[PDB]
From a paper:
A bacterial multicomponent acyltransferase from Pseudomonas protegens (PpATase) catalyzes such Friedel–Crafts C‐acylation of phenolic substrates in aqueous solution, reaching up to >99 % conversion without the need for CoA‐activated reagents. We determined X‐ray crystal structures of the native and ligand‐bound complexes. This multimeric enzyme consists of three subunits: PhlA, PhlB, and PhlC, arranged in a Phl(A2C2)2B4 composition. Very recently, the scope of applications has been extended to phlACB, which encodes the cofactor‐independent acyltransferase PpATase referred to above. This catalyzes the reversible disproportionation of 1‐(2,4,6‐trihydroxyphenyl)ethanone (monoacetylphloroglucinol, MAPG) into PG and DAPG in a divergent reaction. The composition of the multimeric enzyme complex is thus best described as Phl(A2C2)2B4, in which the four copies of PhlB mediate the binding of two PhlA and two PhlC dimers to form the complete oligomer.
The final structures showed the hexagonal crystal form (space group P6122) to contain two copies of each of those subunits in the asymmetric unit and the orthorhombic crystal form (space group P212121) to contain eight copies of each subunit. In both structures, an analysis of protein–protein interactions within the crystal by using the EBI‐Pisa server yielded a heterododecamer with four copies of each subunit as the most likely biologically active oligomer of PpATase. In this heterotrimeric arrangement the proposed active sites of PhlA and PhlC (see below) are adjacent to each other on one side of the cavity, whereas PhlB (especially through a long loop formed by residues Glu74 to Val87) closes the cavity on the opposite side. Even in the untreated (hexagonal) crystal, residual density was observed at the side chain of Cys88, thus indicating that this residue is at least partially acetylated. Whereas the conformations of most residues forming the active site of PhlC are similar in the structures, Trp211 in particular stands out because it adopts an open conformation in the untreated crystal and closes the cavity upon substrate binding in the soaked crystal. Inspections of the cavity observed in our structures in the vicinity of PhlA suggests that there is indeed enough space for acetyl‐CoA binding. However, key residues necessary to catalyze this Claisen‐type condensation (a cysteine and a glutamic acid residue) are not present in PhlA.
Author numbering:
A (entry chain E), B (entry chain E): 2 to 146
C (entry chain F), D (entry chain F): 3 to 398
E (entry chain A), F (entry chain D): 4 to 362
Write the structure that this text describes.
Amino acid sequence: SMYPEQIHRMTTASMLREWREHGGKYRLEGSQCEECNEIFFPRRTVCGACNSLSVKPYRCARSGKIEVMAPAENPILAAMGYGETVPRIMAMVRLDDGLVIASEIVDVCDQQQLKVGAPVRMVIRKHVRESNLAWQYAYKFVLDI
Amino acid sequence: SMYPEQIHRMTTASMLREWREHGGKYRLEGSQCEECNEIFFPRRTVCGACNSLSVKPYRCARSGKIEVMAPAENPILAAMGYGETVPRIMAMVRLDDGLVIASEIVDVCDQQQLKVGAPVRMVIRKHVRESNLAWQYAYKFVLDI
Amino acid sequence: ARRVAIVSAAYTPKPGSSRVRQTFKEMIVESAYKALKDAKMHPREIQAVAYGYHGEGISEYGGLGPTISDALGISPAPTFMSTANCTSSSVSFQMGHQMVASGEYDIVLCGGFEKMTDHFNYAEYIGSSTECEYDYFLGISHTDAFALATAEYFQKFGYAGREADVLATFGRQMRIYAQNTPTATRYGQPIPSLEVLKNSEACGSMLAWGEASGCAILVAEHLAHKYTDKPVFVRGCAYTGVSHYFGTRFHNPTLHHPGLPKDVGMAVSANSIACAEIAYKKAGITAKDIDVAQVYDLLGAGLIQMESMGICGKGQAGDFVLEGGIALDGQLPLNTDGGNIGRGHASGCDGILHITELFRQLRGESDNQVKGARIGVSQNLGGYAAHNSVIVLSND
Amino acid sequence: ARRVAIVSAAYTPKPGSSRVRQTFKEMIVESAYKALKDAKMHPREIQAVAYGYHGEGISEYGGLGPTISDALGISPAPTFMSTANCTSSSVSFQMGHQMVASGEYDIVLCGGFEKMTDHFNYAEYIGSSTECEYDYFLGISHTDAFALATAEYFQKFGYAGREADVLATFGRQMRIYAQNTPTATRYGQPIPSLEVLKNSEACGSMLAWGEASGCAILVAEHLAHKYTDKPVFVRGCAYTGVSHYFGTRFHNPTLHHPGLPKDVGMAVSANSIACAEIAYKKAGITAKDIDVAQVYDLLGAGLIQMESMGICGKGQAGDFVLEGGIALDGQLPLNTDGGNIGRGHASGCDGILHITELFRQLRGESDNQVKGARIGVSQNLGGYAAHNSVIVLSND
Amino acid sequence: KKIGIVSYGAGIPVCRLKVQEVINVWKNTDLKLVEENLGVTERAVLQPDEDVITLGVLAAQRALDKVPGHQIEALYLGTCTNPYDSRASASIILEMLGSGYDAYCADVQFAGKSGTSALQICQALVASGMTGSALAIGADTINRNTAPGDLTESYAGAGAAALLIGSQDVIAEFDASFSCAADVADNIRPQGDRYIRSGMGLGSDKNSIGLEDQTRRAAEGLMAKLHTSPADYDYVVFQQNLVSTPYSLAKHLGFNPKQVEPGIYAGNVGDAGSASPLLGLINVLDQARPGQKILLVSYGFGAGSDAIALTVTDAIEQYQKHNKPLRELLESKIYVDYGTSIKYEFKYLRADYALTAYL
Amino acid sequence: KKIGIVSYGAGIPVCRLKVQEVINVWKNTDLKLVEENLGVTERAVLQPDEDVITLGVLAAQRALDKVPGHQIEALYLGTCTNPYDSRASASIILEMLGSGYDAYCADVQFAGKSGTSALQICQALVASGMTGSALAIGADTINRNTAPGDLTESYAGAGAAALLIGSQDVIAEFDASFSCAADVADNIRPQGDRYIRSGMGLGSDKNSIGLEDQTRRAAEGLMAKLHTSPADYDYVVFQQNLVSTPYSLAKHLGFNPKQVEPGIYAGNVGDAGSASPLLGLINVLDQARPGQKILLVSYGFGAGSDAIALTVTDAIEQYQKHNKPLRELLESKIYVDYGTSIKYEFKYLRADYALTAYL
Ligand SMILES: [Zn+2]
Ligand SMILES: [Zn+2]
């Protein structure tokens, strides 16, 4: 602050990284194959089913159910930018189109509604800030009831 | 500053790294083999000549000559923490014990004395600050005349 | 094709403990020169090295091969690096096997290390080896994946009311194996009661995490007699790769392996199943033939791998453990050194940690010996089974 | 031991230019599927991959193997990673050669990539692959090492007054080779005069640095006819490792290679000499036999490697270049694609950049063809020749 | 075909902090004053993963969900607590909404009237024929930019409101507007400062020279233009930093309590700045009837005021048929204590450079 | 009667700093690159008593001096270097101008396109009939918000431009416009940060994904709407952070040098941000002829682009009769050294609390 001597840092992110993933992270866009119609998340260049390069963006279903859930409460494993909210409710969310997303559940107003099979919907939230100072935004989920 | 939200950083150094190298970096300590007396910089655990594990710290000679020298002036290659001094005079210094050290020449008061074969001596200087906030100190060289 | 023998294997003891007074170079040298001594071999007889670690983010040292060749004192002999999560050593072992089997090198040192304490807080760095833009940068860890996998296993195979019992029985058996194993972090510790374990962290199934280096020395069959009376042969290996992204465990059309189960996920690791089937076909064995094994233990991951590996049927590993099946007198003795819970875990070294205990078992030198052991198997994984390795060793 | 053939080789064109609109996955797929098409091969025929990059510090993606196996659409087929400076692809090529030669895999894709623009300023990251505590953390770069090496070469072999002439003649020949090579970054650029080059940056010997992925497809000899009429065979390879620390170039008792020159340093690369001698012995050739070559060009490094490789005597490479020796009608045509100056450089891809032009030369398909080329050689280095690779290819 | 509001949406944080939790710590104001006179018993707390963009895109997406497949032609973000001081947060919201890139786009700032100013811009773009439709957002994180121990802390909140303007299926026709402004530094936030600052002591003296002067000037201006008086309006909506503020301004301009009441929402929210007049309007439209007349008069410190007159249409009945009202949305809440609120809103003086989460 | 520009004005700081003065200290870029390729030999230095408001009110007052007794109906201030982050600097300028309080008023922010965005807002307000006229200002102190040692320091400048929109005595008819935007973080300034930051290394890679993409998209969009091509325009005006930028964009979009040259002013000024496209337009209108066609395409990092098409009228000849051109204004200058520039722009790290001027 008072002494502006540059501090060592191996890695600094270019804006290019997040720029290319705005579809995936703001809009839950994966990929669909034009030849066989198989769907994937996250986005990709080659269809895994048939190895076609004719692949297009696909808007994943933004509603789903909690497939599996696990609290994260261990201070030892608190990542920088995620230390303030404890517990965090980590979940695998099964979307209505069949895909599964690794995320977390937030804004739980009634704890008795937080259970396996509970319906959820996607929301845009602030995530850990980028190493180039830009705010990071991406998906999380809330209970939808 | 005003918004204390933690920023993402893959790598943060433990104090352990520099703690173990104070001999090498503050005192120009390499290694000498107890069986065959060969000398090495930087410090090491196995003698390269004879593969003995009987190796001890060795104070390298702190006087030497410039073997080869090259200005670093290209802004594109300015490392963080080293952008303020331009040019930097990079050199391979041949110490009086025969070892060679990669370093730089500083405090050149008479430019006509800066040449190949010029005598130099070790000095302790501040280097790029550590990712744990500790000041980094290590060797550089000056002309000795 | 020619056979490849392990002539020695060794690691820096107590791998669930840290070595803050050593550098990574010093630590690598310790296990390397120990193994060289065990084999009655000079360092300059080593023709190549295959070595593993997590990556350059821990110590800020990249392009590490030459640095290792210099540290060991073998230059110009090359070191081929491997960067593959907790499977780094397992992968480097497979690389060394290829180096010898090819005829290009006759004597090869395989291994790996991890110096977590060089990083201020390694726990938050590890996530960098995942599908980073969609997990690491959203604060999702590997440990989250294992917690979820365990929850899926128990909820879907009807273990409600016995989760604590299963995890505690597992962790207790690991502690029993570690108690009498001198290289284990829990060597000599008293065995806590099942009830004490149930009321402790992760019902007693949390691993012990520290620092270690390790290596095994591979030699062409025709040379092995120069270095040992009792060589351990590599029967077959498989290494397999699927997406790091945890969601893909439930739906991965990219994974082409015929005859997988209909329903796959975290509790049923498709990548691990495929890996085991490939490995066993190459080795000329089936699960029936396995006399002793090693798995990456942590929470319920040991159960999922017991099933993937073919030791018991889908959903039956919990009951197998409860019925005493992994004890020394049980149907399949498993993690006889104590595993990650008892012996300890150091990511890049884990492959060698497995291989060393199997090596010992197959020569009759284990502290918890399986009488008449002919076949030994290492099942190891990296990420949430994004990497998977299966290595099959025999003694004839 | 059985022979291994290259059936196709390809890279993303203009590797001295950046591809900011692509991700690294997209970029890898481009060259992979191009090579697959050239070979008349389906992706699912690939049994394993060996792939290289600088490290996890650029894109913050570690444990990359599974991620690549998923991107290419080959799961469960494994990807073995290589992290070895500018030699990453050269090393991965050698790994693939071992994989096929061993009999463990019959068809293997070898390659590498670099996506420098994922890092804000890659130039200051690269130093992380050195003897970091004694160079990187003191602000000492690889580029400093090359500047110093060049200065030592010229000061000690009596080139005072002709330094500019040597570097400019070299850079001009690279531009001449690049002009008519469609995959080169300097394709179609007019050839500047020798005088214009002397008065420009680094007297015209500064490389063009961008982004690229590349790969070659290796197949067991008995299968090669299915994929090509004109296979290129791997005669022999060597990979060698010495300390990254630049000081050790002058005094390295750790380097055990008999019959090295008495006086070694930066201008005389002992590691590179050792590497070439080992490689040639394995390949059954001498320098006399080499019809065309590739070297890592940058400042005077091309000269130092010409000497290490055995093409001309100590201190004579500058005069060799001035006398026209590396031109297409010269005694030894070198970097016929344009090299790093004309074609371009992308660290992890560079090994394949060399191998592709040699592959083309040995089939008569090069844009600057060496008539009747039988033997082609890639000399590549990593760090200041801490890594060194020599790869020898033939056409019969 | 008349032009006006087609659909709307709102975004409100779920975390809540009871006023007494703040007063127990600072003891710097009367609990009875804030709860009974000012009318605020609890306030919205911003979570660590929430901000103007997260609330704004929630509100906007809720408005656009009413018009399937809508292609965005213009998007204006009214805020005085912008996440960026250079670059437009509006373009980030546009990217997120994923409904077209070819749009008139900017951030708009005049304190609490930013949202109404954005609305006027959107109306002008449609009425001019420069676009067929336009999306206005009003959003603020007043809590985030109010200092611990500030006299306003206990009732600083946050919120977002989005209004789609068009000429197809219009539920409230935009009849006319009148704006005024001047240099009145009753509140400021200098470039750099995180916290919004007062220019003088709080009370009716400060209110008379800013809030009341500008609100009166705009309201009287618009009514003079339309030849109307307070008796001609079914509803009146004012700035709602506090529940007391609309009632006070109504008494000052000759409106009566039953004209104000249907716009009141903020007793459990606190001050949502740019969002507050738009949220009042939303609260009216949720229950209004065809034919009814609305007068909306906002207030931005600095200072100035935007007055807008609207007429509710027949289409309001269909819009209301399957609609989640704001009243229902505001029932969703999670209580937190003072210490937790300060953690969540990043108001502890922690280290400039963090080594881990907790070191 | 067609609607458009009636009068204009400009405000530029008089202090100047030669590029070599910065390069001598930092040695972080080539003198030849900046002087010859980028085309900037010196840059504007902000004095301690100058800012966005001082420049803005100068430009605005110069535009209104052309229309004696004009009553202001709307005033929009486009800037990304705003003196206030809450409250509208526009209301301060309005107060200073002393020509009415009953005006639509706000600050508008989208980086370098803030001024053109304000202009579009004003056009919409007049074309809609919501006002009879409207005053747009574009102004930035890029110098003040560029850090010492930044690669862009040697060519960071400052400036203001004001354009009055109306339907009486119009000198350039506003024919049509097209805007686009997206999330492209090529430059940012997070809330709090004084200095504008790059999102990646400088060069043609960064230019291709922001500057060129958005400029091309808006220009092609507008030309497609009007069924025109570059050959149909007498003048083209782009963002002028650097003299090289308009020529580069012209080459990229199929315009030729003679179409660009008359808009070039910045060789002795540097980057004036929001002002730069408007200053280019002013420089054209100072010498243009009746009938001529102008295409204006701005660029805001973040990112987005505003394209506007204009036609010059017969009234331009009378307007030009007694007019001080921008070319003449830019002849007024005072040279200062690097140390003095840093003092004047408040870029020394002095004590947070001052005891006297010098203690
Ligand atoms: Zn398909
Ligand atoms: Zn010795």
